[PDB]
């Protein structure tokens with residue numbers, strides 16, 4: 001770009017693959033569905049969704065009270081990594097385990113082959129503004145605008161799925177996630 | 189003010205009403221009594237006091253173990269907001285729920301029509317310096333000098349009351365409270 | 377040092393004794409053994425070690441679930457201070473009591489006259505990277521290089537001992553510890 | 565530079581500060597005026613729903629500066645309470661300095677004489693910079 | 698000053714920025730380019746095992762600046778996404794300015810005209826500093 | 831400017847640094863000397879009871895700088911351990927530079943030659959600023 005007779009406007013574009021290859025990253029398919037990836041070469045991922053349908057009921061499923069690792073089947077090959085990524089998500093959500101609603105996860109004898117962690121963000125289940133707090137966290141984490149939208153049941157759901165390149169790595173989301181988990185260990 | 193022949197000393201005073209109308213604020217009546225207001229138009233408030241008399245005993249009243257919302261009667265119209273303001277106060281105190289003494293709140297069948305949350309800050313009930321930690325937090329939060337004073341029983345009490353304009357909004361206290369609760373939702 | 381004909385290189389060395397006399401400090405004997413001192417005149421200290429031998433078993437000893445103060449005998453003269461220093465260490469380790477493995481401490485009827493707090497940092501006991509997280513915290517806290525070394529059982533052990541001048545006060549370690557415990561009370 | 569709205573001030577006057585004075589805001593980390601300007605700018609763009617003040621309060625307000633002022637207040641040392649700010653203004657030219665805080669002791673504003681040396685040098689500093697350009 | 702490696706950039710060119718431009722990095726707290734440069738330098742010294750990026754991410758990346766850009770994005774205001782940075786470069790001399798961020802709205806890079814006033818003054822600023830030395 | 835007390839130093843000499851050198855403290859975020867001065871000032875006003883060092887430690891000490899130095903130490907890179915600081919001092923005039931940290935590798939102070947380029951430019955920088963005034 002020719003600004004003047006002797007001055008030019010130039011640009012540089014950074015490539016952040018090498019810096020954030022081996023660290024957890026996240027991506028937004030749409031304003032309700034998000035994906036968290038432990039590392040670029042992981043064959044599994046965690047899906048974070050805002051849903052209107054209850055999938056886990058308190059009458060039949062376990063609640064997470066300092067036993068999140070039990071929500072993953074003992075026969076999963078990447079069980080420790082999946083529990084670690086769940087903790088990374090939980091710390092990225094800035095979850096208050098003293099005051100926020102107790103998360104639910106699936107029963108031990110579930111027929112479905114996926115690990116589900118459910119948070120009830122319906123108005124009145126938690127303290128005032130808990131739904132808004134979570135939605136604004138989703139906006140800060142994944143760049144979502146779900147919060148900038150108009151009493152029905154609503155949940156934040158974290159399930160495990162196979163990595164199918166549902167998005168492209170976003171190093172801003174990586175920075176937000178890593179900032180929320182500063183001091184932890186990442187990079188193998 | 190005439191500094192010199194061609195220079196003047198001028199001042200500006202800010203009005204912070206519009207910025208902090210809709211956010212929680214706090215005020216200090218005296219070095220022992222403090223008031224937390226959810227918003228300017230709230231008809232209710234939370235009183236934070238440093239008292240020398242036990243009001244709740246461990247033998248007859250409930251202890252807060254991740255069930256703070258139960259300390260508010262289900263028939264209160266602003267129950268969710270009051271629980272939210274209690275959590276805002278608790279996060280502003282920088283309370284350590286793993287190590288700090290367990291708060292007490294009133295029994296379900298209490299005759300008194302107010303919700304009381306009591307923290308025992310008597311020397312020896314908690315770890316060394318817990319009383320000093322809480323008193324210095326009160327100084328940081330409300331500008332109190334209670335800490336800069338001379339083994340008797342002492343408690344930090346949070347009760348609910350009607351807003352009667354016991355103080356004037358202080359945007360420095362508002363900033364301290366909001367900084368302690370960064371990322372939460374405030375403003376309706 | 378004569379830099380040039382009219383310029384000299386001069387130095388000053390600071391003495392941080394008076395600033396950090398009355399605050400908790402820590403020191404590193406070697407890359408596995410560390411010592412935490414409540415104050416310069418304390419006759420007792422807390423030893424933090426990385427060991428390969430199990431000293432407390434889950435089958436016979438208590439686990440720390442919001443009752444750390446119970447790990448100290450009620451007849452110890454500096455019981456409150458020792459519990460306070462334990463909390464300072466725990467906050468300095470950036471311990472996640474929701475997700476990190478539950479610490480073990482000795483039984484009430486232990487014959488040994490020392491209070492032991494054990495954390496299992498063996499690979500697979502906790503989430504992925506928990507051992508690396510703890511070892512890098514040890515590096516940040518005490519300046520240790522234990523993390524920069526090569527599946528056997530490994531534990532982080534905190535015991536109480538008599539102060540025998542095992543090290544010299546290090547005000548960088550003091551700053552790291554105090555930064556991890558900002559807002560607490562220290563200095564009598 | 566920046567011209568404040570009527571509702572931001574209590575004097576009911578049109579106050580606008582030039583870009584030369586406000587350029588010092590990035591350089592200085594101990595300016596409470598710049599922090600209050602950041603709050604007013606954020607609230608201004610917010611007014612013109614969800615309120616995002618909790619997410620931006622760390623970016624707009626320096627926690628360390630607020631903490632220092634609170635600790636100064638607790639020890640009865642003169643402190644900033646973020647309400648009144650003084651500046652030096654060349655009457656004829658209209659050039660002014662970055663408004664500094666008006667300190668408080670014993671729930672009372674510090675008298676002008678009590679920080680005379682503060683507003684002499686600043687005045688002089690202004691009268692020096694004017695001659696540099 | 699600092700010359701970036703091939704893998705740090707997508708243009709496959711040797712880009713090096715002089716110490717005169719990079720000296721402004723400490724002065725400016727709102728430079729995302731400087732943060733990205735700190736990140737690249739840390740990763741560079743890391744490449745040449747344990748990864749210490751979680752401990753240094755606060756020192757390398759300003760949380761407040763990232764938060765401001767995210768809040769700007771959530772409100773559809775032009776924001777920095779930390780990918781493309783523009784600078785003004787005197788073609789003959791080779792002197793350049795500190796690369797500023799290339800803002801984004803609606804998932805699209807801001808057109809050059811849309812920040813023309815941004816790269817006019819900067820260009821002028823360069824052409825002024827060149828004459829001061 | 832600031833004259834340190836006897837108990838703050840181990841040399842048992844009257845050391846005072848002028849306001850010209852100390853004015854750079856606000857500008858520089860990577861000065862550990864300025865942080866140690868802030869600690870000594872706070873402790874000085876504390877000595878002349880409750881100790882408020884835990885509340886002010888974030889305002890006085892930069893967490894990012896301490897973290898960077900610790901990470902440099904863990905990787906055997908030269909680091910600041912906040913103990914010894916070197917400065918350049920014009921013997922005749924008495925004008926000096928802001929004391930920089932004396933780096934350490936392998937539990938031993940870096941030799942003067944090993945940072946010769948550090949104290950040449952600084953010396954030169956001083957000899958330049960002296961001629962600007």
Ligand SMILES: *[C@@H]1O[C@H](CO)[C@@H](O[C@@H]2O[C@H](CO)[C@@H](O[C@@H]3O[C@H](CO[C@H]4O[C@H](CO)[C@@H](O)[C@H](O)[C@@H]4O)[C@@H](O)[C@H](O[C@H]4O[C@H](CO)[C@@H](O)[C@H](O)[C@@H]4O)[C@@H]3O)[C@H](O)[C@H]2NC(C)=O)[C@H](O)[C@H]1NC(C)=O
Nearest residue numbers: 061062063064065066067068069070071072104105106108
């Ligand atoms: C994380 O850890 C928590 C505990 O900290 C686990 O939650 C517990 O789950 C167990 C079983 O999974 C529950 O135990 C069941 O309790 C019933 C009665 O509980 C009363 O009290 C609790 C309050 O604690 C109320 O929630 C509840 O409504 C009742 O009022 C019993 O009916 C159950 O009996 C079952 O076992 C017996 C054999 O022992 C069988 O005969 C029965 O048919 C039946 O299967 C059972 O004892 C316990 O209530 C839960 N506690 C809480 C606080 O919720 C989570 O499961 C765990 N999560 C993970 C992921 O590991």
Ligand SMILES: *[C@@H]1O[C@H](CO)[C@@H](O[C@@H]2O[C@H](CO)[C@@H](O[C@@H]3O[C@H](CO[C@H]4O[C@H](CO)[C@@H](O)[C@H](O)[C@@H]4O)[C@@H](O)[C@H](O[C@H]4O[C@H](CO)[C@@H](O)[C@H](O)[C@@H]4O)[C@@H]3O)[C@H](O)[C@H]2NC(C)=O)[C@H](O)[C@H]1NC(C)=O
Nearest residue numbers: 044071072073075076077110111112113114115160161162
């Ligand atoms: C998302 O997360 C979920 C749970 O967190 C994972 O789903 C689990 O996946 C594991 C495998 O990793 C499944 O475990 C395997 O199940 C097989 C069949 O299970 C039956 O087990 C008995 C058999 O009668 C009955 O209870 C019932 O019929 C079950 O259907 C077994 O064949 C497997 O065992 C084999 O391997 C093990 C380990 O090598 C050997 O010890 C055995 O001998 C045998 O060879 C194994 O147990 C588990 O069932 C799944 N959970 C559920 C709830 O169904 C997802 O895989 C995970 N996805 C991703 C992408 O991470």
Ligand SMILES: *[C@@H]1O[C@H](CO)[C@@H](O[C@@H]2O[C@H](CO)[C@@H](O[C@@H]3O[C@H](CO[C@H]4O[C@H](CO)[C@@H](O)[C@H](O)[C@@H]4O)[C@@H](O)[C@H](O[C@H]4O[C@H](CO)[C@@H](O)[C@H](O)[C@@H]4O)[C@@H]3O)[C@H](O)[C@H]2NC(C)=O)[C@H](O)[C@H]1NC(C)=O
Nearest residue numbers: 249250251252253254255256257258259260292293294296
């Ligand atoms: C938040 O949640 C906590 C639990 O997490 C609640 O605290 C519990 O409160 C219940 C009742 O409110 C208590 O249950 C009572 O326990 C007595 C025996 O408890 C022994 O063990 C506990 C240790 O857990 C000791 O503290 C205690 O001293 C005893 O050694 C029983 O005597 C009680 O019986 C009552 O109910 C029966 C009917 O079931 C009646 O017949 C009796 O007359 C009597 O009314 C009762 O079971 C429980 O001990 C408390 N736990 C703890 C850990 O303190 C809080 O109340 C709750 N707070 C809020 C605000 O919701």
Ligand SMILES: *[C@@H]1O[C@H](CO)[C@@H](O[C@@H]2O[C@H](CO)[C@@H](O[C@@H]3O[C@H](CO[C@H]4O[C@H](CO)[C@@H](O)[C@H](O)[C@@H]4O)[C@@H](O)[C@H](O[C@H]4O[C@H](CO)[C@@H](O)[C@H](O)[C@@H]4O)[C@@H]3O)[C@H](O)[C@H]2NC(C)=O)[C@H](O)[C@H]1NC(C)=O
Nearest residue numbers: 232259260261263264265298299300301302303348349350
């Ligand atoms: C500070 O916080 C406290 C508690 O956190 C609040 O005090 C409670 O206030 C609520 C109202 O918000 C009270 O609830 C009402 O009580 C009335 C009388 O209670 C009696 O209930 C039965 C009747 O026999 C007995 O247990 C006993 O005699 C009680 O005294 C009822 O008339 C009310 O019910 C009416 O309204 C409800 C809801 O609309 C209807 O469903 C009913 O049909 C009926 O019309 C109601 O239950 C409660 O009692 C108070 N608590 C206590 C412990 O006394 C304060 O109000 C609060 N203050 C502020 C400023 O926030």
Ligand SMILES: *[C@@H]1O[C@H](CO)[C@@H](O[C@@H]2O[C@H](CO)[C@@H](O[C@@H]3O[C@H](CO[C@H]4O[C@H](CO)[C@@H](O)[C@H](O)[C@@H]4O)[C@@H](O)[C@H](O[C@H]4O[C@H](CO)[C@@H](O)[C@H](O)[C@@H]4O)[C@@H]3O)[C@H](O)[C@H]2NC(C)=O)[C@H](O)[C@H]1NC(C)=O
Nearest residue numbers: 437438439440441442443444445446447448480481482484
């Ligand atoms: C901090 O607080 C925790 C609780 O929050 C304490 O941990 C408890 O410790 C007590 C005793 O110290 C344990 O109680 C014992 O439980 C046994 C059965 O427990 C079952 O369930 C638990 C799950 O909660 C499982 O861990 C366990 O394996 C069992 O499945 C009983 O066998 C024990 O009986 C003992 O007492 C009776 C008299 O009452 C005697 O007759 C017996 O011989 C025997 O001595 C006993 O009741 C309890 O299980 C522990 N809970 C947990 C969750 O671990 C920590 O001790 C405490 N720590 C400190 C430092 O204070």
Ligand SMILES: *[C@@H]1O[C@H](CO)[C@@H](O[C@@H]2O[C@H](CO)[C@@H](O[C@@H]3O[C@H](CO[C@H]4O[C@H](CO)[C@@H](O)[C@H](O)[C@@H]4O)[C@@H](O)[C@H](O[C@H]4O[C@H](CO)[C@@H](O)[C@H](O)[C@@H]4O)[C@@H]3O)[C@H](O)[C@H]2NC(C)=O)[C@H](O)[C@H]1NC(C)=O
Nearest residue numbers: 420447448449451452453486487488489490491536537538
């Ligand atoms: C590191 O931390 C540990 C524990 O956290 C401390 O060890 C404990 O130290 C205390 C003293 O501070 C010991 O308590 C004393 O024990 C003596 C003997 O204990 C016996 O008690 C009965 C007697 O039959 C039996 O259970 C058994 O034989 C025990 O061996 C008693 O003589 C002491 O009592 C005396 O003093 C008390 C208080 O003044 C008086 O009330 C009594 O009348 C009497 O005069 C006292 O109980 C305790 O035993 C130790 N723990 C263990 C597990 O052995 C370390 O001291 C601590 N070290 C540091 C440097 O901090």
Ligand SMILES: *[C@@H]1O[C@H](CO)[C@@H](O[C@@H]2O[C@H](CO)[C@@H](O[C@@H]3O[C@H](CO)[C@@H](O)[C@H](O)[C@@H]3O)[C@H](O)[C@H]2NC(C)=O)[C@H](O)[C@H]1NC(C)=O
Nearest residue numbers: 054056057058104120121122123124125126151152153154
């Ligand atoms: C998630 O939280 C929501 C919000 O609290 C829960 O839904 C609520 O469930 C309660 C009962 O558990 C419902 O109360 C019932 O309301 C009807 C009136 O329509 C009445 O017939 C019943 O007697 C009772 O009062 C409440 O209406 C309902 N709220 C909504 C918006 O549907 C939900 O159960 C929670 N789910 C999980 C999995 O935690």
Ligand SMILES: *[C@@H]1O[C@H](CO)[C@@H](O[C@@H]2O[C@H](CO)[C@@H](O[C@@H]3O[C@H](CO)[C@@H](O)[C@H](O)[C@@H]3O)[C@H](O)[C@H]2NC(C)=O)[C@H](O)[C@H]1NC(C)=O
Nearest residue numbers: 242244245246292308309310311312313314339340341342
């Ligand atoms: C708040 O914490 C204080 C401080 O621990 C508690 O008061 C203390 O209560 C214990 C008993 O629970 C008292 O011990 C008793 O002391 C007397 C000696 O005077 C003796 O006769 C008894 O055998 C027993 O040892 C202790 O003295 C007392 N402390 C004070 C300063 O009074 C208080 O109970 C706690 N209250 C609540 C509501 O949590």
Ligand SMILES: *[C@@H]1O[C@H](CO)[C@@H](O[C@@H]2O[C@H](CO)[C@@H](O)[C@H](O)[C@H]2NC(C)=O)[C@H](O)[C@H]1NC(C)=O
Nearest residue numbers: 001009010011012013707708710781799806809
């Ligand atoms: C940023 O600079 C790049 C060069 O690094 C510009 O891309 C070139 O643009 C010219 C002129 O249109 C083309 O002839 C070249 O083929 C382009 N090269 C490449 C590698 O893309 C690009 O236009 C600039 N981007 C802007 C101004 O947004």
Ligand SMILES: *[C@@H]1O[C@H](CO)[C@@H](O[C@@H]2O[C@H](CO)[C@@H](O)[C@H](O)[C@H]2NC(C)=O)[C@H](O)[C@H]1NC(C)=O
Nearest residue numbers: 356358359360645646647648668671672673674
């Ligand atoms: C800052 O301090 C001044 C006092 O120096 C406060 O001004 C007083 O405000 C109260 C109402 O809160 C009035 O009744 C007084 O008349 C005012 N005094 C003066 C001298 O103007 C001001 O409120 C303080 N602001 C904060 C946020 O603490």
Ligand SMILES: *[C@@H]1O[C@H](CO)[C@@H](O[C@@H]2O[C@H](CO)[C@@H](O)[C@H](O)[C@H]2NC(C)=O)[C@H](O)[C@H]1NC(C)=O
Nearest residue numbers: 168170171172778779780781801804805806807
């Ligand atoms: C920064 O924003 C630009 C868009 O302005 C993004 O560039 C796009 O990247 C996607 C892949 O993620 C490509 O499909 C598009 O073609 C790119 N568009 C342009 C105009 O180059 C860029 O990815 C964004 N970076 C981040 C970290 O969000």
Ligand SMILES: *[C@@H]1O[C@H](CO)[C@@H](O[C@@H]2O[C@H](CO)[C@@H](O)[C@H](O)[C@H]2NC(C)=O)[C@H](O)[C@H]1NC(C)=O
Nearest residue numbers: 544546547548911912913914934937938939940
């Ligand atoms: C900073 O590093 C120096 C070494 O370069 C340390 O100085 C040593 O201090 C010990 C006592 O702790 C003495 O035994 C040595 O003789 C000293 N060596 C030298 C060369 O002076 C200094 O203690 C370190 N400070 C900190 C806080 O780590």
Ligand SMILES: *[C@@H]1O[C@H](CO)[C@@H](O)[C@H](O)[C@H]1NC(C)=O
Nearest residue numbers: 639640668669670671672673
């Ligand atoms: C503080 O100022 C008040 C206001 O007049 C005065 O009465 C008081 O004596 C002063 N000093 C103290 C220590 O309160």
Ligand SMILES: *[C@@H]1O[C@H](CO)[C@@H](O)[C@H](O)[C@H]1NC(C)=O
Nearest residue numbers: 189672673674675676677678
């Ligand atoms: C406050 O300072 C002014 C200086 O302008 C002086 O005239 C006035 O008397 C002072 N007030 C008091 C109460 O000392």
Ligand SMILES: *[C@@H]1O[C@H](CO)[C@@H](O)[C@H](O)[C@H]1NC(C)=O
Nearest residue numbers: 772773801802803804805806
């Ligand atoms: C944003 O940009 C897209 C891209 O073309 C455009 O379609 C859309 O209308 C713009 N505005 C909004 C509000 O989405």
Ligand SMILES: *[C@@H]1O[C@H](CO)[C@@H](O)[C@H](O)[C@H]1NC(C)=O
Nearest residue numbers: 001805806807808809810811
């Ligand atoms: C983008 O801006 C450039 C100015 O260089 C202009 O030529 C082009 O038409 C613009 N693109 C659109 C889609 O408006």
